[model samples]
Target chain A: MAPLQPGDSFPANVVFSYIPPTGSLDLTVCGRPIEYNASEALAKGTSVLVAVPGAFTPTCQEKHVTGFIAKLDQLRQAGVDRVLFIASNDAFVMSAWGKANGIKDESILFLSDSDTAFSSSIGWANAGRTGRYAIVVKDGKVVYAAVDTVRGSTEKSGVDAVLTVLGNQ
Target chain B: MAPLQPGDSFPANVVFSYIPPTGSLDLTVCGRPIEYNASEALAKGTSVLVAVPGAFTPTCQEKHVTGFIAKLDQLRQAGVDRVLFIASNDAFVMSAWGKANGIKDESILFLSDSDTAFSSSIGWANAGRTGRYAIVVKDGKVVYAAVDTVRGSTEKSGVDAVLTVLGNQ
Candidate 1:
């Protein structure tokens, strides 16, 4: 599969799985996970996608995702309409991760790249998991794409990098 | 592997994976999932094991597990010291499932039969997942073993069957 590069139009028919947010804050209730049409939505607006290897792991949870969550307003000011955090996990686990982070509605989404479908299609999977990576789509065109091949490093594909790219572009 | 039966001693070296329970109920904090020694834990007292194919699904979550949770007192009165629910999902998902069900601590243990190893070793696996079954072990020796092979049925392996077996035995 060809890896996505800057200037490429967001791939068509790209989808991921996620459990829609509910009004209930209770973690005891299991929500039904459903498919999200990501490509279409991303094409319609300025969106950022941050892909992580797995959910509930230290590197992704404590290190990587927290940055984006904390700088959401800064990202919004940078013209980002939505931030989607995805992993090579089931929709339920992704949903729990979102809830654990105190994310109420769908402001920041936690999505499952089911079967590593979207990641593998773009050559960014880490064996059986999604590789740590980030992508920014401006309108319908990709303006930034970065993948971290180094172990335990989020240097090039993190919130900081995304902000830097937005600042320069 | 020979399937466990009513008269056989609980197998030694049988282990499953789980995340230790923490006082914090936040779903956002990812717990480090670890391996749990099931054989060691089960040998010390009377225990019950209920295995399902997967977690967070309708039948397994909404139907099968709720019964066991509701009848926990009855199982305790019947000399069952602990009840372990296992699935083919990873320890993180299993732990999240427990949290979603409002299970705190190890009162009702949720475990992951990793790679379906334990289930496959006991000839009770559903392809790559754990098969629907229930086993009651009394003082290290199995007293009841039931498996439900029929589609859309928990008749043979549900909590009611376990209660019936306990009452009869």
Candidate 2:
């Protein structure tokens, strides 16, 4: 499948952990616990989805996720309804990383594409791992998308870049 | 397949992330990154294998791994050449969790059974997730094994319990 682009409908089957604004019991899929569903969340509002290669990696922790967490309000002001951090790690690990980063507030959601299903479906897998990328979706359709050619470089996919894209829309 | 038992040979094909006592590059199976091979690790000497349902889960974080981490020297004194902590979470998640737990010291190795291969092969899967369990392996054979019937109870599988079993053996 080609890389998802503007106008492409977000795949309905992509599932990840969803941390509610207020905490809730863990959710499960197929009897195995899960977190959130991107398609379902996007169906309700405009959202920013950022995919990182790995959780707690140097660049991801220092720049990519940090940038979004630091500028979440600005992105919301720019018309984004939600911001999600996606990784190929399991939901449990994602939750831990979120806690370590002091993300108790609901400004951003952490999602785990444990099997890389969501990442691979959108042509973002690099050797069975998620590649760095970002997409903005509105009403279940992509409005902007960016994939980083350099693995650790978030130049085109950081918060400022995504905020600019949302502003243009 | 029945649940693994004492005297049962540890499965050779079970793959996980192996943090060598001396650090090395990550290993993989079939192009998907991996850490440790249960059978290979067992080939060398006595080992304690602790399997948790997920990383960062309450019981696991607060009690399960903490217990093992606290009793590593005792486990080694009980004739265990190495102590391995295995979870069904992916390798990246395991790596991050290991770092979070201050696992820089190699007294314990963290292994990720990303696909639940080892968990399922030994009938330890509960709906595609690894059930909590622990085993002692000596010369590539299971010498003791315990599975927690109650999902959150690690009492019977924690370090103290396993060390007691090893002492008896």
Candidate 3:
């Protein structure tokens, strides 16, 4: 299959949510079933999608997050409607990572694609342990997107590039 | 002073490391005072750098590590020079979290910035628990970077952004 490119429509089927912080839940993030639709989620607001090699990985921990934390003003000024960070893990892990990052539901929404249904549906998914990418959607249609093909170094693709596009928007 | 901007440079002065999978004294990713000018350890060939809001947080526990585990191959292809995950907690907590994340050292590099010296130098440091960010460096230069502003939600930053940059690079 071809890699997902810019201007592709978001997949119709995908669901994401977080695991409870302190309690065990039946939810999972990878290769699990989802109950929501990509269109539905995007319809709620402008969608900014970003993916990484993995959560807790070094660059994802330091640089990516530093950019978000440091450049929030720029992002907000760029008129970003919303930003979604997707990982190939479960809802519980997403939820816990969110809390650990100090972002509660009130600040930013944390969703999971544990089963990778959402990731693969968008054509951003790959066969490797984790494939990283980001897409921007408006009214359920993609406007911008990028995926990380190089793991060792930080290159612009996901949030940074999407934000750059949105900033120009 | 004004906050750091995209081109701003900071000193790398933190030092620490984690146990390797084989239970050896793995210091490749640790022991160096990290600065923008400092050379990277362990990540010489391939590595991933991840950030967390804090150590021992739930989401960080489940998803962060799991995300790395899930995407190990993609990361390698992405030219992963090394894997370094950091937290704002002290070295003790960082050590504990590394174990909880199932770090085998051979798989990923775990480090601590408990003193906030390295983080502050980079302008990635912030209040409200621990600010999250990651940097993917190739040959000792930052090629991938992300920062979490609001904390908690791994949605905006983290693996999603990391992967996006890697794919494009």
Candidate 4:
């Protein structure tokens, strides 16, 4: 199995814990206890899916995710309909991390790939941990995919790279 | 292998996140990142080890762990040197769950069997999730063991059962 590449369709069965917008009720899909699937949830629009090794880890907390949150509006204005942060940690930990980062209004959705099912399906897992990466999905097809080669280095997978890809899209 | 039972020595190689007392630093064992091992962490005296399927789950949050937190002082007076909660979640999630439960002091320790290494080693895992069980360890020996037969039912694995066993011990 190879990593998902541009022009590849995101796997629809790869479920993730989708934190709904404020005041929205939670529900299940596909017999799994999840709010939505990555393919289903972001199918209607252009979405940026960022994968981090772990939540609250040094580089992830300080830069990788922080960059996305800081430039969220700009990304949205550039035609990104959704921004999601996925990690190997469980949904509850991602929720707590979002809350700690003051993501109260649901400007960005935090999803959990707890079991690494989705990460491994996309060939993004390294040694049981999700590697730092970013994929831009326009409608249902991946427009760009960037995986960081160096551990803890967000050079190619940071928000700026996603924005650059979005600008060309 | 069957689930560990009383008269069996607690496994020494199993690793978990060990949050030290206030101001203490973290360390590793057996090439895995952990604060301490099961034997060394509870070596000082008697310890109650409670295992739950997941942290922040409905029953675990509402009744299981809440009861343990409410009865912390009572358990200590009953000769419980340490009360440790082990879960299949990662270390960061377990740490956050502990904080959310108001674990400001080191009265209780939250340990993470993140990879299910410790849980599966003792035959307590079901489909990658840890089963609800409780063990009383005294000087690195399993003095008592109670495993819940019914899913989501902690009747035999709750604090009362542990207290009863400790009383008999």
How many angstroms is residue B118 displaced in model 4 relative to the true structure, after the best TM-score fit? Answer: 3.0
CAPRI band of model 1?
acceptable
Which residue runs does candidate 2 get wrong by more than 4 Å? Answer: A1-16, A20-46, A58-63, A70-81, A113-131, A138-141, A148-156, B1-3, B8-15, B19-40, B60-62, B126-128
Model 3 CA lDDT for position A24: 30
Q: Which lDDT value does model 1 have at A69?
A: 80
The model with the greater lDDT, 2 or 3, is: 2
Candidate 2 chain A — worst ten consecutive residues by lDDT sum?
A24-33
Order the candidate numbers by TM-score, best to worst: 1, 4, 2, 3
Per-residue CA lDDT of candidate 2, range B1-169, in tens? 5678888888777668643432432211012244566678787789888888876665423478888888877887888898888887665556555656667656777777766777887888765568788988999888888888775577778887898888887
Which lDDT value does model 4 have at B68? 88
Among all windows of 10 consecutive residues in model 4 chain B, the one with the lowest summed lDDT is B23-32
lDDT (Cα atoms) of all candidates against the true structure = 0.83, 0.72, 0.55, 0.73
Model 4 over residues A46-160: C-alpha lDDT tens digits? 9888888877553323478888889988997999887888887767566656665657665777778867788888788867577788988887888888889786578878999
Model 4: per-residue Cα lDDT over B1-169, one tens digit each: 5567888888877667744434322111111235657778666689888898876554323378878888888898899888888887766666656666667567878778766777788777877678888989888888887878676677888988888888886
Residue A126 lDDT (model 2): 67
Q: Regarding TM-score, does 2 or 3 come out ahead?
A: 2
Kindly report the docking quality category of candidate 2: acceptable
Question: Candidate 4 i-RMS (Å)?
Answer: 10.7
Misplaced by over 4 Å in model 1 are A28-30, A58-61, A149-152, B28-30, B58-61, B149-153
| Candidates ranked by DockQ | 1, 4, 2, 3
lDDT of 2 by residue, A1-169 (tens): 5778899888787788643433432211112345676678898688888888776554323478888888877887787788888887666566666665557656777778867888887788866568888888999999888888774578878888888887786
Model 4 misplaced stretches (Cα beyond 4 Å) = A9-14, A19-32, A58-62, B19-33, B59-62
